[PDB]
Coordinates of C-alpha atoms and ligand atoms in Angstrom, one line a residue:
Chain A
X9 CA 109.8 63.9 158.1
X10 CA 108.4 66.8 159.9
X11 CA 111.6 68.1 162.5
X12 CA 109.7 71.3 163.1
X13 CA 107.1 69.2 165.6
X14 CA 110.1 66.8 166.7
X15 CA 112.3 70.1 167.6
X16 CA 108.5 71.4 169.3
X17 CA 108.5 68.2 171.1
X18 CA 112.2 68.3 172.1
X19 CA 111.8 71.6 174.1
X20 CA 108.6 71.0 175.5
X21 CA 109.4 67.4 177.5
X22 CA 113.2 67.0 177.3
X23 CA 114.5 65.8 180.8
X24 CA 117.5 67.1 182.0
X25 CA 119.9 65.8 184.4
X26 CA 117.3 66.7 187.5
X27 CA 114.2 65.4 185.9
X28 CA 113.3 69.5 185.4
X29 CA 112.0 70.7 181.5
X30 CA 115.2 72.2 181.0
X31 CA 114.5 73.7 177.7
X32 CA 111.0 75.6 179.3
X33 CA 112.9 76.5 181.8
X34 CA 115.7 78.2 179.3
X35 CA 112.9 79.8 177.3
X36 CA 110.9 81.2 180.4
X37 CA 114.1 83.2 180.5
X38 CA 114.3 84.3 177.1
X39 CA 111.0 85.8 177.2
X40 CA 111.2 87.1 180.6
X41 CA 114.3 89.4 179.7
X42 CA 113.5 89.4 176.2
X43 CA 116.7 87.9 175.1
X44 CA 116.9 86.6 171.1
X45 CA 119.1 83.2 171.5
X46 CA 118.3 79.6 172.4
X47 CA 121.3 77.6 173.5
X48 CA 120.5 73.8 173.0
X49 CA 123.4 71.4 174.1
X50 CA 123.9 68.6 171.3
X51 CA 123.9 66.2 173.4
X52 CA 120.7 66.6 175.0
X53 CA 119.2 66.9 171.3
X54 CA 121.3 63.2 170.4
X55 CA 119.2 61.6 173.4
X56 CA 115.8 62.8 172.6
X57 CA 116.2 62.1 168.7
X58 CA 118.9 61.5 166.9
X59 CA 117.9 62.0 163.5
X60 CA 116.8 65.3 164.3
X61 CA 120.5 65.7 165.5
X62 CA 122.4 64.6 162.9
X63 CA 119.9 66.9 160.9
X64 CA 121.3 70.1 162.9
X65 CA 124.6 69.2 162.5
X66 CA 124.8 67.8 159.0
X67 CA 121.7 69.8 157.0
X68 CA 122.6 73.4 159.2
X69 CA 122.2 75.5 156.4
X70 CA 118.5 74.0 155.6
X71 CA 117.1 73.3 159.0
X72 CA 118.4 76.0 161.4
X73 CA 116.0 78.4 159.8
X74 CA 113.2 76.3 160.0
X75 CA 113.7 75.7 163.8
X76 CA 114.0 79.1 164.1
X77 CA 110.9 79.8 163.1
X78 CA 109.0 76.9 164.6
X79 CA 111.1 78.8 168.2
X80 CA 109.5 81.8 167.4
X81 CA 106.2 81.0 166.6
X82 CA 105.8 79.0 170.3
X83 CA 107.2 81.7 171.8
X84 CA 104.4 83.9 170.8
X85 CA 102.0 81.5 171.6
X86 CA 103.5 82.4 175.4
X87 CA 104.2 85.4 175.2
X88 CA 102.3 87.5 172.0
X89 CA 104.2 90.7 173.2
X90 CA 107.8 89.2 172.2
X91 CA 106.8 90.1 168.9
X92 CA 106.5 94.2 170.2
X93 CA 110.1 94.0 171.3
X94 CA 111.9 91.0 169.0
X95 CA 111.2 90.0 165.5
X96 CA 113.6 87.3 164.8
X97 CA 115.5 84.8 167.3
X98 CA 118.3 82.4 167.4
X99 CA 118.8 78.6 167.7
X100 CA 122.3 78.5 168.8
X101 CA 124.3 74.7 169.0
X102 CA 126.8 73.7 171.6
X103 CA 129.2 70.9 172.4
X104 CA 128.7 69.4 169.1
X105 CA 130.9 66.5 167.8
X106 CA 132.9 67.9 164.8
X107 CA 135.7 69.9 166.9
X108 CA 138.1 70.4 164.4
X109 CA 142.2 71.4 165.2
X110 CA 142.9 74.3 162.7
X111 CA 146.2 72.9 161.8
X112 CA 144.2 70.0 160.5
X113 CA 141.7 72.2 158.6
X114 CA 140.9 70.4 155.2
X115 CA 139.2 71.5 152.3
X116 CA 136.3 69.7 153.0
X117 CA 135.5 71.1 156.0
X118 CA 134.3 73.8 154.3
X119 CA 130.4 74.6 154.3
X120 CA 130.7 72.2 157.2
X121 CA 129.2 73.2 160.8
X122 CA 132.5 73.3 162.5
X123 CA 133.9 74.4 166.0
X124 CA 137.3 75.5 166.9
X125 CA 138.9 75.6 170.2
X126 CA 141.3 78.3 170.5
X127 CA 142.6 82.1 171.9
X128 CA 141.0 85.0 170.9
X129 CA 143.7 87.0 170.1
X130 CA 142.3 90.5 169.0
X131 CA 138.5 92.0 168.0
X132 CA 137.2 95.3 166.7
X133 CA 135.0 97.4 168.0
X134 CA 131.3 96.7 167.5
X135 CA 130.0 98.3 164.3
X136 CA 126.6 98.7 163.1
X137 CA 126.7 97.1 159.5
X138 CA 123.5 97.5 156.7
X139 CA 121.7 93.9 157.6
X140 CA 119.3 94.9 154.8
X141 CA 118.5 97.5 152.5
X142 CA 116.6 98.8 149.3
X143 CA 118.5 101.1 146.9
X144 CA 117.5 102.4 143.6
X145 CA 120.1 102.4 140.6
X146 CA 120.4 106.5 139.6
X147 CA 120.8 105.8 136.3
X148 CA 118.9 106.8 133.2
X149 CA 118.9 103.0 131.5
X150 CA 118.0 101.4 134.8
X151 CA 115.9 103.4 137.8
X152 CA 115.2 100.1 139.2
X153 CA 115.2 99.1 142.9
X154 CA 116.8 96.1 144.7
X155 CA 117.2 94.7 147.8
X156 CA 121.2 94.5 149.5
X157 CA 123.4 92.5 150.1
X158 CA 121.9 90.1 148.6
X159 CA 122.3 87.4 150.7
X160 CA 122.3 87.8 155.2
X161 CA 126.0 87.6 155.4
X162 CA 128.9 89.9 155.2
X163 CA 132.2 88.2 154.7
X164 CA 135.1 90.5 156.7
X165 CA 134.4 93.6 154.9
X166 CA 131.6 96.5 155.1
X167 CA 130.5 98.6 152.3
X168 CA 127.7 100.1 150.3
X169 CA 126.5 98.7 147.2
X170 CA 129.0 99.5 144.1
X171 CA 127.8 97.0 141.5
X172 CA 124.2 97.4 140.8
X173 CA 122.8 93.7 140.7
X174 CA 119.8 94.3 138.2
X175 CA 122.2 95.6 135.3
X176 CA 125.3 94.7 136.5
X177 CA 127.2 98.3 135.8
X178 CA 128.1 100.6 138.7
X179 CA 127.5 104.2 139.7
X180 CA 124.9 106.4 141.5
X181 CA 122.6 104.2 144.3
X182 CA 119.8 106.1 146.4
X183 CA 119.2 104.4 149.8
X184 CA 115.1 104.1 150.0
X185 CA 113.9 105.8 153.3
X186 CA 112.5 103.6 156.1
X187 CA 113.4 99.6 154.7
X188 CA 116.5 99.6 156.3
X189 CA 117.2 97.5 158.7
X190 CA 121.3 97.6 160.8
X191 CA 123.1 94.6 162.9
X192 CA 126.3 94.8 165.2
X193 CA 129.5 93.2 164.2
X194 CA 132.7 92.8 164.8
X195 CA 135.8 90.7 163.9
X196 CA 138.0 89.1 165.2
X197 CA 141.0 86.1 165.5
X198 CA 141.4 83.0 167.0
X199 CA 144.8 81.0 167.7
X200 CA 146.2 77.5 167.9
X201 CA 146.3 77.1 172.0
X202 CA 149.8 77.3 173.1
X203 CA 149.5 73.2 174.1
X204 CA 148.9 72.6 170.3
X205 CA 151.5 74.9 168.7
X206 CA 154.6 73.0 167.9
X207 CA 158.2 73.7 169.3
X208 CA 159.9 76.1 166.9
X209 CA 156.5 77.0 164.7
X210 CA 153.8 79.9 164.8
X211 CA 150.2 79.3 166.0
X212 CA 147.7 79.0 163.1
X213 CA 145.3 81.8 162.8
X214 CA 141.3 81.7 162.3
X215 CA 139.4 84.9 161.0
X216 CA 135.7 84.9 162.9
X217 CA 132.7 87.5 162.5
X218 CA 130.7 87.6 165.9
X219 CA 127.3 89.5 164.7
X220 CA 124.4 90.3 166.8
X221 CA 123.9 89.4 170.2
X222 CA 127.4 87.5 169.9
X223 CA 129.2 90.9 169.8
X224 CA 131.4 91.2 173.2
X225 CA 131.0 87.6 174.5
X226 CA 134.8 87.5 175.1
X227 CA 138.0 89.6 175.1
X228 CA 141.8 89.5 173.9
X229 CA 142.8 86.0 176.0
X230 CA 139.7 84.5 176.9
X231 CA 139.8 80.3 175.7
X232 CA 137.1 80.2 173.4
X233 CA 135.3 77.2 171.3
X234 CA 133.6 78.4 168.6
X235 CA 131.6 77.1 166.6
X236 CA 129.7 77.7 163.1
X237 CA 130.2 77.1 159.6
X238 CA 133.6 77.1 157.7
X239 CA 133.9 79.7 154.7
X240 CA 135.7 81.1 151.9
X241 CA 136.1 84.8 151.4
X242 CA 136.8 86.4 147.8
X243 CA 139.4 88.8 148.5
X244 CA 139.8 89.6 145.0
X245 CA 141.8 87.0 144.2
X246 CA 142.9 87.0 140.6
X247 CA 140.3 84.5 139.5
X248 CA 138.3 81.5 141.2
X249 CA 140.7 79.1 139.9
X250 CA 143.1 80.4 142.7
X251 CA 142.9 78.3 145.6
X252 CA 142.3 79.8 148.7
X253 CA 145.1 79.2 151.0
X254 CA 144.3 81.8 154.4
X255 CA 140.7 83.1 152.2
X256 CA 138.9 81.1 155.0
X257 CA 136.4 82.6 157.4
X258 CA 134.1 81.5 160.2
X259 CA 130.5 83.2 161.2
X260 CA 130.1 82.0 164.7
X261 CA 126.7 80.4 165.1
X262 CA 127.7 79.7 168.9
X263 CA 130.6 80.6 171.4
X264 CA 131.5 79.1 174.8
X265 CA 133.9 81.2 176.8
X266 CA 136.4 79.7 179.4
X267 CA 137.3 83.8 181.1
X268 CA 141.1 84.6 181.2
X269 CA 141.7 85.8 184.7
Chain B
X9 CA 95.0 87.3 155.1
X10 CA 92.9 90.5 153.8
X11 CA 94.0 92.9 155.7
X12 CA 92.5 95.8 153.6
X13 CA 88.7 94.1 154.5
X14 CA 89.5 93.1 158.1
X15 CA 90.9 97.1 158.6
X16 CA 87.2 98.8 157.4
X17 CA 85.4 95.8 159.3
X18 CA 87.7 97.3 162.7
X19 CA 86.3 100.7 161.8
X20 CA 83.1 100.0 161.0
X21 CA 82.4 97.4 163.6
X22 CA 84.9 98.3 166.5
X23 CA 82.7 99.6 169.9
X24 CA 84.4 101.7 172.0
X25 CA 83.3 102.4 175.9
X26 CA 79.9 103.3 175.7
X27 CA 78.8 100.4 172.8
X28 CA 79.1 103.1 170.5
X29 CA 80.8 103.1 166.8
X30 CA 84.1 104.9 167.7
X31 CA 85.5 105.3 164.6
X32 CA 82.7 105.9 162.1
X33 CA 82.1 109.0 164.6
X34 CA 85.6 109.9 163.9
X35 CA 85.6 109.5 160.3
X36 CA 82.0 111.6 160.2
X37 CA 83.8 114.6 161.6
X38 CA 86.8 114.0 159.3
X39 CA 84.3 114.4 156.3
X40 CA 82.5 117.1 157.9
X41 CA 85.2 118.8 159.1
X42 CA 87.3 118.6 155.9
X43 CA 90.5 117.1 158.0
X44 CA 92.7 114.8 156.1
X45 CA 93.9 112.4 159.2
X46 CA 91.9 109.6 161.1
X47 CA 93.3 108.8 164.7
X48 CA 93.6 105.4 165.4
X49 CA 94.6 104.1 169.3
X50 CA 96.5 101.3 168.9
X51 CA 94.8 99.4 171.8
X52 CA 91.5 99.0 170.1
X53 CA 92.8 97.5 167.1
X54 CA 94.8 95.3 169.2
X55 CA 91.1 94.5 171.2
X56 CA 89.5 94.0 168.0
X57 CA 92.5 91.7 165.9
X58 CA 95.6 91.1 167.1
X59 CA 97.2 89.9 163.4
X60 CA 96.0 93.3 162.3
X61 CA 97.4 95.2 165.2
X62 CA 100.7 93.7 164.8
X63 CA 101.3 93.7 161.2
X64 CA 100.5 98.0 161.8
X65 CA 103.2 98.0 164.1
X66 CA 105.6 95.7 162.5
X67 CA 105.1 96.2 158.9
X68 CA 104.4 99.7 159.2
X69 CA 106.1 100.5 155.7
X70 CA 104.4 98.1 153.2
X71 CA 100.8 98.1 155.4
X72 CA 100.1 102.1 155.6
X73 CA 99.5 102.3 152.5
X74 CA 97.4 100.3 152.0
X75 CA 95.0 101.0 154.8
X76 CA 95.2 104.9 153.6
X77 CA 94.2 103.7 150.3
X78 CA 90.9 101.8 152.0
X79 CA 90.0 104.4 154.5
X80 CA 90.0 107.2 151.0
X81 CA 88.5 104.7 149.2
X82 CA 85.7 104.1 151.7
X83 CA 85.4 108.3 152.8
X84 CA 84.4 108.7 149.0
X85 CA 81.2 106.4 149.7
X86 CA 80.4 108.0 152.3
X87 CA 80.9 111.4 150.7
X88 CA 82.0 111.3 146.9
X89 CA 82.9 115.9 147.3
X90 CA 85.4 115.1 149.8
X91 CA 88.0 114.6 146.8
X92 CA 87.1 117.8 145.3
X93 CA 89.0 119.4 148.9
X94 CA 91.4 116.5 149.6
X95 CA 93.3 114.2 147.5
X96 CA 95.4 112.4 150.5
X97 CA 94.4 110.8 154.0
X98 CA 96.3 109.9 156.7
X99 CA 96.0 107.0 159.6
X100 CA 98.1 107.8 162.4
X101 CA 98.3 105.3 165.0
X102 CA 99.1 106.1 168.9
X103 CA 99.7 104.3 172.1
X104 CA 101.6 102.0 170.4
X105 CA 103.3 99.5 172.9
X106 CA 106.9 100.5 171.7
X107 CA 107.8 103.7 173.9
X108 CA 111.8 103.9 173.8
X109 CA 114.1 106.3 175.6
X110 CA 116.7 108.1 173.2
X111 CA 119.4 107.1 175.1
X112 CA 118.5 103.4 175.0
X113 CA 118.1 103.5 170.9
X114 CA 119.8 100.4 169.8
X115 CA 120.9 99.5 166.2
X116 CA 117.8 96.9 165.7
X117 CA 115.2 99.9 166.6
X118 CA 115.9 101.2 162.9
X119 CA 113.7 100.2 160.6
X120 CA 110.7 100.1 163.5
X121 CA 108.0 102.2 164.5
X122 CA 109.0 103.6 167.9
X123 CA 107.5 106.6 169.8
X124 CA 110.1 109.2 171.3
X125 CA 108.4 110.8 174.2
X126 CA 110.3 113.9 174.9
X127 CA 110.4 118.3 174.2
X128 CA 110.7 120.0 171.0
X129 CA 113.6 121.8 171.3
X130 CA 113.5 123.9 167.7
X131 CA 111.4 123.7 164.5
X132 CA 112.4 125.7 160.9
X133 CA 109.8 127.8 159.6
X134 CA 106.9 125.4 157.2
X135 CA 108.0 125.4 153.5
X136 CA 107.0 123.4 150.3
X137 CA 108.2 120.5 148.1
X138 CA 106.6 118.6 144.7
X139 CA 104.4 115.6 146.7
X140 CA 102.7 114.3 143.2
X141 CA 103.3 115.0 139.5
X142 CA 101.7 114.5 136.5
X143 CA 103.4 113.9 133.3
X144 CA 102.2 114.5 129.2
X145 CA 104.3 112.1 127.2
X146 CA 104.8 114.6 124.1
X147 CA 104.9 112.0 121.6
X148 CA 102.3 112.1 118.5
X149 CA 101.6 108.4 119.1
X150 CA 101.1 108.8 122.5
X151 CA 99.7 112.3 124.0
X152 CA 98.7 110.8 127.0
X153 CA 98.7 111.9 130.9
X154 CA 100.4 109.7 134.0
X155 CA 101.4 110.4 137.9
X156 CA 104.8 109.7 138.6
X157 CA 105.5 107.6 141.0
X158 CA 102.8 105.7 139.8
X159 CA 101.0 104.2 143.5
X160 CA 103.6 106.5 145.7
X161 CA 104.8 109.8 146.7
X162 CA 107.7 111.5 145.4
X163 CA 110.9 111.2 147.3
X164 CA 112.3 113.7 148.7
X165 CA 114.0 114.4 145.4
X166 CA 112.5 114.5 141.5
X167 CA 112.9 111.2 139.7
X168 CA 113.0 112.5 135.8
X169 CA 110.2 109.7 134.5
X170 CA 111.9 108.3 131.3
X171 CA 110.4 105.4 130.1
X172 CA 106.1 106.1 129.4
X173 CA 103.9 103.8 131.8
X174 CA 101.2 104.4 129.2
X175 CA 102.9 103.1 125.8
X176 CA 106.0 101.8 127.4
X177 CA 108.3 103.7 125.5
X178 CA 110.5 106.9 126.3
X179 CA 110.6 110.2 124.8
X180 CA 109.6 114.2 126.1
X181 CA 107.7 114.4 129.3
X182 CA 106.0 117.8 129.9
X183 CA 105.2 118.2 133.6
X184 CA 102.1 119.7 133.9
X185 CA 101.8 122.7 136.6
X186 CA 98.5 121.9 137.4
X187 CA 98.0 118.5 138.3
X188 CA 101.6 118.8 140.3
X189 CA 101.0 119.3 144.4
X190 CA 102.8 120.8 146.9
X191 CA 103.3 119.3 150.3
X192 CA 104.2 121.8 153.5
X193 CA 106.9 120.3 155.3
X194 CA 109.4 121.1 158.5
X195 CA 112.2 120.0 160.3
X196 CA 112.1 119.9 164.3
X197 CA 114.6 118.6 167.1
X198 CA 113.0 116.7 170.2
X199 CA 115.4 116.4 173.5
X200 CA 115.6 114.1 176.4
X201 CA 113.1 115.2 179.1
X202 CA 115.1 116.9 181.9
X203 CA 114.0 114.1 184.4
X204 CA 115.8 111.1 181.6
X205 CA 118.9 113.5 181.9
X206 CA 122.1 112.0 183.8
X207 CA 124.0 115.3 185.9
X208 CA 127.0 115.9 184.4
X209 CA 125.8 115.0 180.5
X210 CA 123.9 116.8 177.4
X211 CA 120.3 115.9 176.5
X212 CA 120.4 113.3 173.6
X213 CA 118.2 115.3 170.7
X214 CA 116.9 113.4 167.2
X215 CA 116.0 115.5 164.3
X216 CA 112.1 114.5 163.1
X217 CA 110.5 115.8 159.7
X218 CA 107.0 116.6 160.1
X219 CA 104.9 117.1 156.9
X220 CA 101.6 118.2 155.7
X221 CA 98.8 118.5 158.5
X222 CA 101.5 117.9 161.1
X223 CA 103.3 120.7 160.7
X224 CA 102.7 123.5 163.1
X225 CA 101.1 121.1 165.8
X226 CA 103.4 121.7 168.1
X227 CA 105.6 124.6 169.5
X228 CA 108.9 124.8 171.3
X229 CA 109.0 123.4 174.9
X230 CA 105.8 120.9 174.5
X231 CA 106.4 118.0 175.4
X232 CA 105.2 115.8 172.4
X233 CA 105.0 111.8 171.9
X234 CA 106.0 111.2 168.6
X235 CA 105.3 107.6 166.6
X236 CA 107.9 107.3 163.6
X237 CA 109.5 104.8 161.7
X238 CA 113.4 105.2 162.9
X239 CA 115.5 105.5 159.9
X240 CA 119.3 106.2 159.0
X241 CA 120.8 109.3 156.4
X242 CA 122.4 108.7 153.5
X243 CA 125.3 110.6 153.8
X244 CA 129.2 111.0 154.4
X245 CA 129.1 109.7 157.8
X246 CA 133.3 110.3 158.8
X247 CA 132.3 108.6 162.0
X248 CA 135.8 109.0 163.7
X249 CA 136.0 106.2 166.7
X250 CA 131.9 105.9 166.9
X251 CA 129.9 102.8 167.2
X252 CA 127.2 104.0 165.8
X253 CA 128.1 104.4 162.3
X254 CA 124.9 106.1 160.8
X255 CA 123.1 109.8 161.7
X256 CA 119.2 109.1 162.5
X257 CA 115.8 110.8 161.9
X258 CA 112.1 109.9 162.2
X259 CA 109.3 111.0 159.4
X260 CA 106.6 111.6 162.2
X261 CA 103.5 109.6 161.5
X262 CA 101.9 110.5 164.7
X263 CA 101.6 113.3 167.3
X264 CA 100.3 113.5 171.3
X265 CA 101.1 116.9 172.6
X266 CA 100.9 116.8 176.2
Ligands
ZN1 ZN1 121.2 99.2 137.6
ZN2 ZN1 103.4 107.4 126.2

């Protein structure tokens, strides 16, 4: 089953509402004003193919990247110049069905694509973060070089590298000149709406990490419904066989804003 | 995809204006000449493949390299006493399609090659570091000679070699004075042009390292394009309130002086 050509297929002739290529239209746009984000409505995705879908919405992990790059490369088949001014760009889901209330958060809902409707509450200023970069171990039984962090995700907390990944012990790291590459973040919370907060109890809390061009997209108040994939966040906790009671975290894939006036 | 083969077909092939052979013109008077850097304009090697053009551009750090290799490699066909004057060539590409204003420098332009077009404000006097050394593992076994870094250029700093690429082992390394080069280097700071200036604010500046046959190819007040991949400092940042986190630079790789 080839979903790259069915996604392909999906933005080129998907109907919308008007009869009008909504999805050419949407990328005309993202080329025009170089932007780096798709937004594809679920819904419109369910009616064209449904196993390609479920797919996005059950396999996210897998696929998303794979869609990503199948976006990409038809965008420089448009446009060979995107690639001057973006290298990378974003498939970003809305108005899927797995809206979850946070008082109702279970345990398997983790590594699940997710959304949570809710009030921002407070964010941090944007940061610039290390996306990716290669150090070199200072150390006379290593001198070896390694790429960090390891994965493409940074759970709460910046830093530098302190534990060296090739030998495992700590100390000096030398940053290699000119493979470094930095992304925006910020953090921020997310509460239980006021209508879902029972009489005489305090509104659950979510921790979220907006990165990239998601930094800004709403303020202190604003209703938001976020969505992206429930995770688990080490804060040191004594061992693994602790279970995590708040250690849960959402990176947003997608946000939808309704503006607090 | 080759890119090594497709890069000395572009300079060997490529026909400029007139139907003539550009570049092996070019690369004649580099031999003749004894200069160490081949200009490249980014535009014909974007006429003559685009893959190519775009991987210079976009995979600037890993591709260079490789190209410089090719280009010596091919110079000491064409001229095998050209290494007995220079060890090291250069392939600086200009005009590239990525022209970005200082104060527009976002956090995903690090890591890029970007051109800065503004005035050289101040440059420090030309001195010298270590570019290459060679090594004698003193070791009866062994006695044997190496370059370290083995297929790159000494960081900024000395890396002590400790284990022997030769036998594999560690042991004494005695650096030997004559097979160790020196490369001239400066530092330089390049301004806003008074015309990108708001009224009321400070020219934005960016400190740039220019090394080797770079240095000196420009004076204060020029106004100077410079091509360079943008990169942070490792260093104690205390960034008190700032978005940007990191202090930048650009290692030049190119120069048009205006
Ligand atoms: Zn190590
Ligand atoms: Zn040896």
């Amino acid at each position: 089953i080839d979903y790259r050509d069915v996604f392909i297929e999906f933005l080129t002739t998907f109907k919308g509402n008007n009869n009008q290529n909504k999805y050419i239209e949407r990328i005309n746009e993202l080329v025009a004003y170089r932007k780096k984000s798709l937004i594809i409505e679920f819904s419109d995705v369910l009616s064209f193919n449904e196993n390609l879908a479920y797919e996005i919405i059950n396999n996210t992990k897998i696929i998303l990247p794979i869609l990503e790059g199948a976006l990409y490369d038809h965008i420089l088949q448009l446009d060979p110049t995107y690639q001057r001014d973006i290298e990378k760009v974003h498939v970003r889901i809305v108005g899927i069905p797995r809206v979850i209330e946070l008082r109702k958060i279970r345990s398997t809902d983790i590594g699940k694509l997710i959304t949570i409707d809710g009030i921002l509450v407070k964010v941090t200023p944007v940061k610039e973060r290390i996306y990716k970069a290669t150090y070199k171990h200072i150390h006379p039984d290593c001198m070896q070089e390694f790429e960090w962090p390891e994965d493409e995700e940074m759970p709460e907390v910046l830093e530098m590298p302190t534990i060296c990944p090739k030998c495992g012990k700590p100390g000096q790291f030398r940053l290699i000149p000119e493979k470094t590459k930095l992304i925006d973040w910020q953090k921020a919370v997310i509460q239980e709406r006021p209508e879902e907060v029972p009489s005489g109890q305090l509104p659950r809390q979510l921790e979220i990490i907006l990165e990239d061009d998601l930094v800004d997209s709403a303020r202190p108040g604003d209703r938001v419904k976020v969505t992206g994939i429930l995770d688990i966040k080490q804060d040191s906790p004594v061992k693994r066989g602790s279970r995590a009671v708040f250690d849960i975290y959402m990176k947003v894939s997608s946000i939808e804003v309704s503006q607090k006036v």
